[model samples]
Target: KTHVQLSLPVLQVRDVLVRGFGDSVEEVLSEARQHLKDGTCGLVEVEKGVLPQLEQPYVFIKRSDAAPHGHVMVELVAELEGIQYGRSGETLGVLVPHVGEIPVAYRKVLLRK
Candidate 1:
């Protein structure tokens, strides 16, 4: 028997409840796959009648201002695409949506039954 190894992304979360809103892993994965099929697979563009909001959703240390973590801002050009909305209507699982950049990190990584 042969087993294929798959590489997945790793994401950190401060609050799982707030981040994932208690959604199943399979559901999230399904959502991500759907996004990939659609054209809405890249940086979210919040257009304002003709202007594009170039502010990307970046991740940085909470205490970035502190000396310990200061100047530690690492910019990641993540491809953000809306996967699906949670039941709570507050959390939206997003797909990284990268072709060459596989194994993108997600806040929660789990297999479903």
Candidate 2:
């Protein structure tokens, strides 16, 4: 008897690891984005004018390759009571997952520099 362990692309939403919607980072991001808007999912946000948002239970993914200074690549912050913001600026970044190869369409958007 042989048990197979398949290691495909995975996207983790909070503490839950997701391999849904196929092995596409876009898919994972889509899921995360959905939750950010779904009005639920245990995400919280606090606002501060001019400065970056103060979010609680922040959902973030670290770059496979630590960038700038081993900082958070993607930050899903609360944009609305039931919504979240995915932004990369200042000291934070958003690292989409797809193993080693990032999707092509995202290259222009994700790899801005």
Candidate 3:
């Protein structure tokens, strides 16, 4: 008789993709361009506006560890700056662009010898 034990960490996947106004878009775009030019990419914090509707925006880094079945967990955090205008109020949702997909391989399903 043989016994096998398998443990996998719980992962949280947050929706980081967001749509923002002119200023917010500019900030994110500029930062992204800078990172690309500098050959580095990671989280970048941003700020927009003042007064009652201030916003603190941030970027999310989908590292190599986020590969499917990589064991490591990942989460994305994002914020947008805009006014919610709707008769039914504001509804929040994430829109993932076509180019934001990454694939990876996975192994180790139970114990076998």
Candidate 4:
């Protein structure tokens, strides 16, 4: 019996998705498989992009703020939440994508979609 855990860059995963995982998916797949001379990981989750067969999807919590690391920067947003959070056109799913970094060794890795 054998088992393998892997580590992947969260940011790269996102980029791959945006690119539709059209071709780059192959590259990342190899990277994950040969992560080590043996193979497999856990530190991070590698999100497969759309291709012949994309990996399962997940609910990611990507970074979308850039204020500072000193203290909490809270804002009283007095705005409604309807058009912003609502999906339009009724889509099926997204292009290939997965999950970045210490801002380096990091998959925005998430689960339970």
Give the best candidate by lDDT: 2
Candidate 3 residues 1-113, lDDT tens each?
Answer: 12122221111123223222124544644553344334232221222321123223432322212122422222232344543211221211111221232212222112111
Using alpha carbons, what is the TM-score of model 3? 0.23
Task: Give lDDT tens digits, candidate 1, residues 78-98.
Answer: 222423222221112223333
lDDT of each residue in 22-61, candidate 2, tens digit only = 2334444555455433422222111233123322223333
Ranking by TM-score: 2, 3, 1, 4
Ranking by lDDT: 2, 3, 4, 1
* Clashing residue pairs, backbone N/CA/C < 3 A, model 2: 73-93, 73-94, 74-93, 74-94
RMSD list, candidates in order: 14.2, 14.5, 15.7, 14.0
Off by over 4 Å in 3: 1-23, 44-55, 62-78, 81-113
Model 1 lDDT-worst window of ten: 59-68
Q: In model 4, which range of ten residues has the least summed lDDT?
A: 74-83
Each candidate structure's TM-score, on Cα atoms with residue i matched to residue i, is 0.21, 0.24, 0.23, 0.20
lDDT of each candidate versus the true structure:
0.25, 0.30, 0.27, 0.27
TM-score quality measure for candidate 1:
0.21
Model 4 TM-score, 2 decimals: 0.20
